[PDB]
Structure formats: structure tokens, C-alpha cells
Design an enzyme around this catalytic site. Structure first.
Site, PDB file in Angstrom:
ATOM      1  N   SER A 189     -11.844  40.512 -24.410  1.00  0.00           N
ATOM      2  CA  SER A 189     -11.728  39.756 -25.542  1.00  0.00           C
ATOM      3  C   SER A 189     -12.704  38.465 -25.686  1.00  0.00           C
ATOM      4  O   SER A 189     -12.649  38.015 -26.708  1.00  0.00           O
ATOM      5  CB  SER A 189     -10.431  39.375 -25.877  1.00  0.00           C
ATOM      6  OG  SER A 189      -9.630  40.602 -26.127  1.00  0.00           O
TER       7      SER A 189
ATOM      8  N   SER B 111      -6.053  36.634 -30.072  1.00  0.00           N
ATOM      9  CA  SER B 111      -6.899  37.690 -29.465  1.00  0.00           C
ATOM     10  C   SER B 111      -6.555  38.982 -30.520  1.00  0.00           C
ATOM     11  O   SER B 111      -6.506  40.093 -29.749  1.00  0.00           O
ATOM     12  CB  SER B 111      -6.742  37.945 -28.079  1.00  0.00           C
ATOM     13  OG  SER B 111      -7.582  38.510 -27.585  1.00  0.00           O
TER      14      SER B 111
ATOM     15  N   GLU C 265     -12.948  47.696 -31.165  1.00  0.00           N
ATOM     16  CA  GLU C 265     -11.722  47.522 -30.439  1.00  0.00           C
ATOM     17  C   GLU C 265     -11.001  48.898 -30.671  1.00  0.00           C
ATOM     18  O   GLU C 265     -10.878  49.541 -31.878  1.00  0.00           O
ATOM     19  CB  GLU C 265     -10.861  46.350 -30.868  1.00  0.00           C
ATOM     20  CG  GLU C 265     -11.453  45.171 -30.754  1.00  0.00           C
ATOM     21  CD  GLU C 265     -11.218  44.586 -29.122  1.00  0.00           C
ATOM     22  OE1 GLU C 265     -10.581  45.313 -28.441  1.00  0.00           O
ATOM     23  OE2 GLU C 265     -11.582  43.523 -28.663  1.00  0.00           O
TER      24      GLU C 265
END
Length: 260
Positions: free
Chosen positions: A43, A103, A139
Site C-alpha cells: 500500500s 489504506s 488491488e
């Protein structure tokens, strides 16, 4: 150098691989430990995507207020903020803040989409003189942190220099830079990482990252009271795919640096 022997000892005690870059903006001296080795960003890459959107907003002056739809299919594995707005909208500013301060992984994917894919995030890095950063995936797969795999990696030296230019330099316009700093100072995920090894009196802005292979990272800008700011990057990864996170190593590395 005593700091380099202590960092080597910390690494040996930890069983993993530690990478550190410090920039002291007082004299632009640098302290590096495995500074040119590649590490998985996890991240910490969200800083680059947010900064790229901020750069777009220098010309599209209303870009950060644009609403973006959050749909059930957009949700991935970790979406603390986006989940609160499914079947609603969030602005690009709200998504940037969520990606950085919580995050949020759905928010990161929306920023990547706004930039035209991972290649658009990488393009921004190149545009500001970072030849090392590479974003290859979205992601959550960019966190696989496979040993030896160059995808979704950078080096400590490169990321320190880039974070310096974004926050203390002039890679971004003045309002954009101030916004980035404000977002980073407001991170909620960093209490156990670099911040924990530093005097409680110092102001920190940081972005954490974690992934498989026990990958545990933090990149920070530090404003000591009555002293020039520092940039500090700490990356750590381990040999077992199932390894636990080790935020204490990053705290310890910061403490070693601060002692010097």
C-alpha cells in the site's frame, strides 16, 4: 558507520530483509541500508496514485470534487470507507483521503482507473524523475510480494527521493502539495510503525503497507521541532509466504535513525 551496524544487527535479529533510506534535508545527507534493492511496495504505492490525481487537478481545477460511483462489484478485500458508500458516490478527494488515511483498496482501484490503469501511475513517476517505481497490478494482487518478482516494486532510495519531491519539493503545485501533506499527517494506520520509534514531540506524515511474505512497510515525512524535516522509508519482507507482520522492526529502525 554505527547506524549501519545497528541496522544490520536489527535485520539479523529479525530474520527478514530490511531496506532503509533516510534523507536529512538539513544537508541533504543520506543514510541507506539496502537502498538499491527492490522491495514490494504494497500500500505505500497509494501515495503515487494520489499524487498523480493531484497533478491532474493542476489543470482540471475541479477534478477533486468529481463524484465517482461505488458499486458492489467494485469492492475488493479491504474497503473500510468505500463500504460506507456502496450504491452512492465519493469524490476523488474523498477517495484519495480514503486510500491514504485508511489504506482503502477500492479507493486505490478507483484512482488507478482515473489514471487509465497501472501504466498511468507509473507514467507519473517517470514524469517526476523516478525511473525505478513500477506499478503493474491493481488491488489486491499487487500485494503478493513474491521473492524476486519485480512487479509492483521500488527501492528505498528511489521512494525517499520521490516522497521528498512530492511533499517538500515542487513536483506538485502549492495547493496540491499542501493537500498531500495534510492527508499524510492524518494517516490512521501508522501508530505502531515509524511513529512508534520517534519522539512523541515530532510531527509525522506517513503511509503504511503490508502484504504477503510478512511484508511490512512505512514511508514518512518527519518534522522535528526546530529542525529541518527528514524523509524516512522503511521496507521489510520475510522468507515465509505466511509470515506475520512485523511493525516493530520499522519502529526499531526509526529509533536507530533518530538516535543518530
Amino acid at each position: 558507520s554505527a547506524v549501519q551496524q545497528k541496522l544490520a544487527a536489527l535485520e539479523k535479529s529479525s530474520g527478514g530483509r530490511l531496506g532503509v533510506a533516510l534523507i536529512d534535508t538539513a544537508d541533504n545527507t543520506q543514510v541507506l541500508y539496502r537502498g538499491d534493492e527492490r522491495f514490494p511496495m504494497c500500500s505505500t504505492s497509494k501515495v503515487m496514485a494520489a499524487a498523480a490525481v493531484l497533478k491532474q487537478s493542476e489543470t482540471q481545477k475541479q477534478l477533486l470534487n468529481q463524484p465517482v460511483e461505488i458499486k458492489p462489484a467494485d469492492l475488493v478485500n479491504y474497503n473500510p470507507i468505500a463500504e460506507k458508500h456502496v450504491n452512492g458516490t465519493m469524490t476523488l478527494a474523498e477517495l484519495s483521503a480514503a486510500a491514504l488515511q485508511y489504506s482503502d483498496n477500492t479507493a486505490m482501484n478507483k484512482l488507478i482507473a482515473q489514471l487509465g490503469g497501472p501504466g498511468g501511475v507509473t507514467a507519473f513517476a517517470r514524469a517526476i524523475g523516478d525511473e525505478t517505481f513500477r506499478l503493474d497490478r491493481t488491488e489486491p494482487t499487487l500485494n503478493t510480494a513474491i521473492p524476486g518478482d519485480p512487479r509492483d516494486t521500488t527501492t528505498p532510495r528511489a521512494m525517499a527521493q520521490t516522497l521528498r519531491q512530492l511533499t517538500l519539493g515542487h513536483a506538485l503545485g502549492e495547493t496540491q502539495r499542501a493537500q498531500l501533506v495534510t492527508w499524510l499527517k492524518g494517516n490512521t494506520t501508522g501508530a505502531a510503525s515509524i511513529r512508534a520509534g520517534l519522539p512523541t514531540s515530532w510531527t509525522v506524515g506517513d503511509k503504511t503497507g503490508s502484504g504477503d511474505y510478512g511484508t511490512t512497510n512505512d514511508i514518512a515525512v518527519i518534522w522535528p521541532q526546530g529542525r529541518a524535516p527528514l524523509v524516512l522509508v522503511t521496507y521489510f519482507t520475510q522468507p515465509q509466504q505466511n509470515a506475520e507482520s512485523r511493525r516493530d522492526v520499522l519502529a526499531s529502525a526509526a529509533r536507530i535513525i533518530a538516535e543518530g
